[model samples]
Target: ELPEGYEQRTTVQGQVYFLHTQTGVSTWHDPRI
Candidate 1:
């Protein structure tokens, strides 16, 4: 599970990710990436 200050984002290639606002970290992933 992700911590606080995490925002969800959808990519153009149809992928999902989370960005940590506090640390600027990205939990980005995709099967075809």
Candidate 2:
């Protein structure tokens, strides 16, 4: 499942990215297991 306050978006190359709503942080992998 996805983490709270994190939005999932797609890249131009069809990859997934996670963005933290609370902060301006982003990651290509999930922050939690």
Candidate 3:
């Protein structure tokens, strides 16, 4: 499953969001902004 959240105000001054996922299988993904 995945969990997501959005940021109204950011340093970039744009609509930014975040996502978190926890699956049984491990995969290579970049979680860095």
Candidate 4:
């Protein structure tokens, strides 16, 4: 579902976020677009 190197993570508020393994970039929205 997510991009090739993306990981699912959680914030302190229990919000879902994404992380990129190769770039180390994080986002609050889906990066698949």
Query: Against the true structure, whose TM-score is highest?
Result: 4
Clashing pairs in 3: none
TM-score sort, best first: 4, 2, 1, 3
Tell me the lDDT of candidate 3. Answer: 0.35
Over 4 Å off in model 2, which ranges?
A: none
Model 3 residue 23 distance off true place after TM-score fit, in angstroms: 7.3
Q: List, residue by residue over 1-33, the lDDT tens digit for candidate 3.
A: 233432222346453444333443222332342
User: Best by lDDT, which number?
Assistant: 4
User: Which residues of candidate 4, in runs, are more than 4 Å off?
Assistant: none
Assess the local accuracy of residue 26 in candidate 3 as a C-alpha lDDT between 0 and 100. 29
Better structure of 3 and 4 per lDDT:
4
TM-score of each: 0.50, 0.58, 0.20, 0.61
Q: What's model 1's lDDT at 10?
A: 80
Clashing pairs in 1: none
- In candidate 1, stretches whose alpha carbon ends up further than 4 angstroms from where it belongs are 29-33
User: Per-residue error at 6 for model 3, in Å?
Assistant: 12
Global fold similarity of model 1 (TM-score): 0.50
